[PDB]
Design a protein around this ligand. Sequence first.
Ligand SMILES: O=c1c(O)c(-c2ccc(O)c(O)c2)oc2cc(O)cc(O)c12
Length: 156
Amino acid sequence: GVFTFEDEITSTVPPAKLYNAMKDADSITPKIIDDVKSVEIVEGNGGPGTIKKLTIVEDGETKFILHKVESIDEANYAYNYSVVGGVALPPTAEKITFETKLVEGPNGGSIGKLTLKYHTKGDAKPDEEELKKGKAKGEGLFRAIEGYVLANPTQY
Ligand SMILES: O=c1c(O)c(-c2ccc(O)c(O)c2)oc2cc(O)cc(O)c12
Protein backbone atom coordinates (compact mmCIF):
# COMPACT_ATOMS: atom_id res chain seq x y z
CA GLY A 1 0.00 0.00 0.00
CA VAL A 2 0.93 3.68 -0.04
CA PHE A 3 0.36 6.13 2.78
CA THR A 4 0.81 9.80 2.09
CA PHE A 5 1.62 12.73 4.40
CA GLU A 6 1.98 16.46 3.70
CA ASP A 7 4.00 18.95 5.70
CA GLU A 8 5.33 22.43 5.33
CA ILE A 9 8.19 24.34 6.99
CA THR A 10 9.12 28.02 6.71
CA SER A 11 12.39 29.89 6.38
CA THR A 12 13.87 33.34 6.09
CA VAL A 13 16.25 32.13 3.40
CA PRO A 14 15.21 32.72 -0.26
CA PRO A 15 14.58 29.47 -2.16
CA ALA A 16 17.45 29.70 -4.67
CA LYS A 17 20.07 30.02 -1.88
CA LEU A 18 18.47 27.32 0.25
CA TYR A 19 18.23 25.02 -2.77
CA ASN A 20 21.96 25.55 -3.56
CA ALA A 21 22.76 24.82 0.09
CA MET A 22 20.65 21.62 -0.16
CA LYS A 23 22.95 20.45 -3.03
CA ASP A 24 25.86 20.67 -0.54
CA ALA A 25 23.96 18.71 2.18
CA ASP A 26 26.44 15.81 2.03
CA SER A 27 29.22 18.04 3.42
CA ILE A 28 26.98 20.34 5.56
CA THR A 29 25.15 17.64 7.53
CA PRO A 30 28.11 15.98 9.25
CA LYS A 31 29.34 19.43 10.30
CA ILE A 32 26.12 20.54 12.05
CA ILE A 33 24.43 17.33 13.22
CA ASP A 34 26.42 15.47 15.90
CA ASP A 35 24.92 12.04 15.22
CA VAL A 36 25.76 12.20 11.51
CA LYS A 37 29.35 10.93 11.10
CA SER A 38 29.52 10.77 7.29
CA VAL A 39 27.69 10.76 3.96
CA GLU A 40 29.29 8.62 1.26
CA ILE A 41 28.23 8.16 -2.38
CA VAL A 42 28.14 4.37 -2.96
CA GLU A 43 26.91 4.51 -6.56
CA GLY A 44 26.24 7.33 -9.07
CA ASN A 45 26.97 10.98 -9.89
CA GLY A 46 24.65 12.87 -7.50
CA GLY A 47 21.82 12.65 -10.03
CA PRO A 48 18.79 10.25 -10.09
CA GLY A 49 19.65 6.67 -9.09
CA THR A 50 22.51 7.85 -6.82
CA ILE A 51 22.84 5.66 -3.72
CA LYS A 52 24.10 7.37 -0.59
CA LYS A 53 25.14 5.81 2.71
CA LEU A 54 24.67 7.91 5.83
CA THR A 55 26.65 6.83 8.84
CA ILE A 56 24.95 7.60 12.14
CA VAL A 57 25.95 7.09 15.76
CA GLU A 58 22.99 6.66 18.12
CA ASP A 59 23.41 5.42 21.77
CA GLY A 60 27.14 4.85 21.01
CA GLU A 61 26.22 2.45 18.13
CA THR A 62 27.10 2.93 14.44
CA LYS A 63 24.23 2.52 12.02
CA PHE A 64 23.70 3.19 8.38
CA ILE A 65 20.92 4.90 6.48
CA LEU A 66 20.55 4.36 2.73
CA HIS A 67 19.22 7.02 0.42
CA LYS A 68 18.34 6.80 -3.21
CA VAL A 69 17.93 9.95 -5.28
CA GLU A 70 14.69 9.60 -7.36
CA SER A 71 14.55 12.83 -9.39
CA ILE A 72 15.83 16.40 -9.50
CA ASP A 73 14.15 19.50 -10.94
CA GLU A 74 16.42 22.52 -10.43
CA ALA A 75 14.09 25.09 -12.10
CA ASN A 76 11.35 24.31 -9.55
CA TYR A 77 13.69 23.88 -6.50
CA ALA A 78 12.58 20.23 -6.41
CA TYR A 79 14.35 17.16 -5.14
CA ASN A 80 12.92 13.67 -4.65
CA TYR A 81 14.68 10.94 -2.66
CA SER A 82 13.98 7.70 -0.85
CA VAL A 83 15.08 5.93 2.29
CA VAL A 84 15.76 2.47 0.84
CA GLY A 85 17.57 0.78 3.72
CA GLY A 86 19.19 0.88 7.10
CA VAL A 87 17.78 1.91 10.45
CA ALA A 88 15.37 4.58 9.14
CA LEU A 89 13.52 1.98 7.08
CA PRO A 90 11.11 0.13 9.30
CA PRO A 91 10.88 -3.63 8.54
CA THR A 92 7.30 -3.40 7.18
CA ALA A 93 8.33 -0.55 4.82
CA GLU A 94 9.49 -1.10 1.21
CA LYS A 95 10.64 2.47 1.01
CA ILE A 96 9.79 5.94 2.19
CA THR A 97 9.87 8.70 -0.42
CA PHE A 98 10.46 12.37 0.35
CA GLU A 99 9.20 14.67 -2.39
CA THR A 100 10.59 18.19 -1.85
CA LYS A 101 9.75 21.59 -3.25
CA LEU A 102 10.75 25.09 -2.17
CA VAL A 103 8.56 27.97 -3.20
CA GLU A 104 8.99 31.68 -2.45
CA GLY A 105 7.27 32.60 0.80
CA PRO A 106 5.61 35.91 1.51
CA ASN A 107 8.50 38.31 2.45
CA GLY A 108 11.18 36.67 0.20
CA GLY A 109 11.83 33.60 2.32
CA SER A 110 10.88 30.04 1.46
CA ILE A 111 8.17 27.63 2.17
CA GLY A 112 9.52 24.09 2.02
CA LYS A 113 6.78 21.63 1.10
CA LEU A 114 7.19 17.94 1.84
CA THR A 115 5.18 15.05 0.43
CA LEU A 116 5.90 11.82 2.19
CA LYS A 117 5.01 8.53 0.55
CA TYR A 118 5.29 5.56 2.84
CA HIS A 119 5.30 2.41 0.69
CA THR A 120 4.30 -0.72 2.69
CA LYS A 121 4.93 -4.40 1.93
CA GLY A 122 1.41 -5.60 0.90
CA ASP A 123 -1.14 -5.35 3.77
CA ALA A 124 1.26 -3.76 6.30
CA LYS A 125 0.68 -0.33 7.88
CA PRO A 126 3.13 2.40 8.86
CA ASP A 127 4.40 2.62 12.48
CA GLU A 128 3.27 5.88 14.19
CA GLU A 129 6.48 5.90 16.31
CA GLU A 130 8.83 5.74 13.30
CA LEU A 131 6.92 8.52 11.55
CA LYS A 132 7.41 10.74 14.58
CA LYS A 133 11.16 9.89 14.49
CA GLY A 134 11.51 10.42 10.70
CA LYS A 135 9.60 13.77 10.93
CA ALA A 136 11.85 15.10 13.72
CA LYS A 137 15.06 14.02 11.94
CA GLY A 138 13.83 15.41 8.57
CA GLU A 139 12.90 18.79 10.08
CA GLY A 140 16.28 18.96 11.85
CA LEU A 141 18.00 18.27 8.53
CA PHE A 142 16.20 21.22 6.93
CA ARG A 143 17.24 23.31 9.94
CA ALA A 144 20.87 22.15 9.58
CA ILE A 145 21.04 23.38 5.95
CA GLU A 146 19.16 26.54 6.95
CA GLY A 147 21.25 27.21 10.08
CA TYR A 148 24.28 26.70 7.91
CA VAL A 149 23.29 29.20 5.26
CA LEU A 150 22.19 31.67 7.93
CA ALA A 151 25.53 31.21 9.76
CA ASN A 152 27.63 31.50 6.55
CA PRO A 153 26.01 34.45 4.64
CA THR A 154 28.76 34.94 1.98
CA GLN A 155 28.87 31.33 0.76
CA TYR A 156 25.37 31.28 -0.81
O1 LIG B 1 20.28 10.86 12.91
C1 LIG B 1 19.34 10.27 12.33
C2 LIG B 1 18.61 9.16 13.01
O2 LIG B 1 18.98 8.80 14.27
C3 LIG B 1 17.48 8.49 12.27
C4 LIG B 1 16.66 7.36 12.81
C5 LIG B 1 15.36 7.17 12.32
C6 LIG B 1 14.56 6.12 12.78
C7 LIG B 1 15.05 5.23 13.73
O3 LIG B 1 14.27 4.20 14.19
C8 LIG B 1 16.43 5.42 14.25
O4 LIG B 1 16.97 4.58 15.18
C9 LIG B 1 17.19 6.48 13.76
O5 LIG B 1 17.15 8.91 10.99
C10 LIG B 1 17.78 9.93 10.32
C11 LIG B 1 17.36 10.26 9.03
C12 LIG B 1 17.99 11.29 8.31
O6 LIG B 1 17.54 11.58 7.05
C13 LIG B 1 19.06 12.02 8.86
C14 LIG B 1 19.54 11.75 10.15
O7 LIG B 1 20.57 12.46 10.67
C15 LIG B 1 18.91 10.66 10.95
